[PDB]
């Protein structure tokens, strides 16, 4: 496992460190969207920060299931439930939960 730059929006040097993690907060409870990213490891994007993606950049063809683990860094008293969904190829970005 290596840190996946899901929140790869920033570009300035003083905030390059916040690309490693993305935030969650109290919401309105309507099943809003938190983050999206493509599942291609050797494609330009979040997966370039991973050692898996860097190595797959050296190989044209890959085959096998990938695994993504999200670590919650909130306080011990903070709870909540999140839905993480993988959309197989062919379907566009889901409009809602």
């Amino acid at each position: 496992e290596t840190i996946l730059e899901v929140n790869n929006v920033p570009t300035n040097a003083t905030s390059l460190m916040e690309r490693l993690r993305f935030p969650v907060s109290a919401q309105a409870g309507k099943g809003e969207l938190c983050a999206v990213f493509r599942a291609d490891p050797g494609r330009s994007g979040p997966w370039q920060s991973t050692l898996l993606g860097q190595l797959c950049g050296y190989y044209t063809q890959w085959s096998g299931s990938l695994e993504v683990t999200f670590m919650f860094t909130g306080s011990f008293m903070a709870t909540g439930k999140m839905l993480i969904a993988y959309t197989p190829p062919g379907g566009p970005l889901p409009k809602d939960r």
């Binding site: 997966w47 797959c56 044209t60 999200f70 306080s75 993480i84």
Partner: protein, 48 residues
């Protein structure tokens, strides 16, 4: 895609915003084929 199932519930006296760290890896059936050149060349001029 990551969606809020219910909400992020926090009591009084704890931070209202929390961060999530995503770690990515491959399973045991992952294989690679057709070794190719690197897509990025970490070099601008001659390495002096």
């Amino acid at each position: 895609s990551i969606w809020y199932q219910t909400n992020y519930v926090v009591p009084i006296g704890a931070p209202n915003t929390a961060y999530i760290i995503a770690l990515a890896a491959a399973q045991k059936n992952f294989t690679m084929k057709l070794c190719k050149d690197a897509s990025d060349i970490l070099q601008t001029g001659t390495i002096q």
